[PDB]
Amino acid sequence: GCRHVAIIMDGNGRWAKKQGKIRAFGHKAGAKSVRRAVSFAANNGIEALTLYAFLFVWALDSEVKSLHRHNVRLRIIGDTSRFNSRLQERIRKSEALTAGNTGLTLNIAANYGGRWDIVQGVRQLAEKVQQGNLQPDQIDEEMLNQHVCMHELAPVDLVIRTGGEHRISNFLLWQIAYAELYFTDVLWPDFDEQDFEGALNAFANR
Amino acid sequence: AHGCRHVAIIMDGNGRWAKKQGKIRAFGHKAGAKSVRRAVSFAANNGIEALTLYAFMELFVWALDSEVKSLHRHNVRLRIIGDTSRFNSRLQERIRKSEALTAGNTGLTLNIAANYGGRWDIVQGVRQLAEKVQQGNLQPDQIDEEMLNQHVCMHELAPVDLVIRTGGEHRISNFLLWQIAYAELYFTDVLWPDFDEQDFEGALNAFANR
Numbered sequence: 001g002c003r004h005v006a007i008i009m010d011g012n013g014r015w016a017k018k019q020g021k022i023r024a025f026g027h028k029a030g031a032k033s034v035r036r037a038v039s040f041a042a043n044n045g046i047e048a049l050t051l052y053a054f055l056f057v058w059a060l061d062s063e064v065k066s067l068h069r070h071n072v073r074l075r076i077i078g079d080t081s082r083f084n085s086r087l088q089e090r091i092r093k094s095e096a097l098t099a100g101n102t103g104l105t106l107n108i109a110a111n112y113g114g115r116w117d118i119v120q121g122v123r124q125l126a127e128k129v130q131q132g133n134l135q136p137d138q139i140d141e142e143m144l145n146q147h148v149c150m151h152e153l154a155p156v157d158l159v160i161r162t163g164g165e166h167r168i169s170n171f172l173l174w175q176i177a178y179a180e181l182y183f184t185d186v187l188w189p190d191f192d193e194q195d196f197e198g199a200l201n202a203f204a205n206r
Numbered sequence: 207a208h209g210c211r212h213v214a215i216i217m218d219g220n221g222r223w224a225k226k227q228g229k230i231r232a233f234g235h236k237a238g239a240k241s242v243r244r245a246v247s248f249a250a251n252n253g254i255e256a257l258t259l260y261a262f263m264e265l266f267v268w269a270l271d272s273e274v275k276s277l278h279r280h281n282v283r284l285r286i287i288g289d290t291s292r293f294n295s296r297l298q299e300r301i302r303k304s305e306a307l308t309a310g311n312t313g314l315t316l317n318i319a320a321n322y323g324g325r326w327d328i329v330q331g332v333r334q335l336a337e338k339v340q341q342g343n344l345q346p347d348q349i350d351e352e353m354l355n356q357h358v359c360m361h362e363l364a365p366v367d368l369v370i371r372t373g374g375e376h377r378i379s380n381f382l383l384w385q386i387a388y389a390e391l392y393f394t395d396v397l398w399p400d401f402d403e404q405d406f407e408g409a410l411n412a413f414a415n416r
């Protein structure tokens with residue numbers, strides 16, 4: 001069964017323009033598609049769902065109460081150290097609120113890049129070496145792994161990209177070494193529970 | 207015109223191809239070698255700068271010798287990527303020689319993965335950087351993406367523009383990781399021994415259109 005699904009949610013802009021509407025309308029329909037995918041994963045026993053929008057967190061932090069009632073653990077991945085400190089504190093508070101939740105873990109990428117993610121772990125090892133706490137030839141895959149995002153969760157089983165492009169676009173790199181990759185032309189606001197189940201079958205047929 | 211400078215291929219389907227024919231596996235590998243020659247000639251004749259091949263055998267790579275002379279005669283530059291350091295001195299020495307012989311060539315650059323993994327590739331780059339930090343040459347905070355980029359396999363070649371995987375599975379299987387952050391990914395159900403010039407044209411024209 002699929003334990004950790006990651007989604008590159010692309011197509012909101014193209015959807016709005018096909019509908020003859022401004023870019024803001026596609027965002028609002030995108031956010032409804034987020035709610036539906038989060039609900040569907042939580043009801044189908046997926047352990048972790050990681051969402052990359054291909055700031056906008058301001059929106060979310062009015063849904064945290066609902067997540068928390070639903071037993072969802074919320075985490076933001078990505079470089080938030082330059083966000084304003086009021087947002088950084090609201091991120092911190094939301095993560096602390098839900099940290100003890102034992103249902104679905106929802107990871108929201110916010111200023112995230114796969115290369116950045118690896119580089120941030122390398123910087124950490126680099127400090128250890130400079131402190132004299134670590135030998136260069138003791139650095140292996142297992143050790144680097146312990147310093148990249150999500151290393152405490154089930155490995156990513158399946159990556160879905162909506163919107164028609166066939167690229168990872170510097171979303172997760174280290175983590176997707178063994179993941180099933182599923183590409184669909186459906187635009188993110190139209191991506192629904194049947195589309196999600198479609199992807200879960202491609203994995204079931206691996 | 208296709209716009210593609212560096213194509214990487216996960217060559218899968220040799221076992222399935224032989225099974226479909228009622229053959230033992232040594233036959234799929236032989237047909238797979240023929241398809242390698244064909245892809246290499248196709249790339250060299252269609253302006254691609256670099257072609258990087260991942261066989262998804264140890265006796266297969268050893269037999270290369272006849273092959274390296276044919277490469278050289280077609281002005282291909284050969285390089286092996288992967289961890290060759292626990293290979294026998296002897297193999298290691300024929301690798302160096304084969305590289306040295308062809309390193310002046312000006313046509314296609316052909317990279318062959320041998321004991322390669324994406325994760326390993328990143329790890330070896332990180333170790334090069336950690337050595338420099340330990341000898342006091344490098345500060346932890348000067349380490350950025352461009353710098354780690356300069357230490358992974360193939361950094362001196364054009365970025366990988368297109369990854370092709372034959373054989374039907376939709377995964378990277380710990381082939382390139384760092385290097386494919388922006389690459390076009392093209393999956394075909396065609397098995398590797400059947401993948402021919404028109405399938406390769408098809409993948410290039412798909413990259414051009416996308």
Ligand SMILES: CCCCCCCCCCOc1cccc(C(=O)/C=C(\O)C(=O)O)c1
Pocket residue numbers: 031034035038039042043059060063066067070072
């Ligand atoms: C801009 C992004 C906004 C969306 C952020 C995700 C918030 C999702 C809010 C609902 O969260 C869950 C989690 C687990 C289960 C359910 C769930 O059962 C929802 C329902 O039954 C319903 O909405 O009718 C909802």
Ligand SMILES: CCCCCCCCCCOc1cccc(C(=O)/C=C(\O)C(=O)O)c1
Pocket residue numbers: 242243246247248250251267270273274276277280282284318
């Ligand atoms: C361990 C390294 C083994 C990799 C083996 C690949 C062998 C490829 C040999 C064929 O090479 C080329 C290269 C470029 C062009 C051509 C090519 O067009 C050759 C011809 O037209 C011909 O020989 O008549 C052949």
Ligand SMILES: CCCCCCCCCCOc1cccc(C(=O)/C=C(\O)C(=O)O)c1
Pocket residue numbers: 239240242243261263264266267270273318319320321322323
């Ligand atoms: C026409 C000439 C045929 C070209 C032959 C090219 C295939 C060469 C492949 C060499 O493959 C090796 C050699 C030694 C070890 C490995 C190997 O272990 C690869 C792995 O473990 C892995 O990818 O996880 C692969």
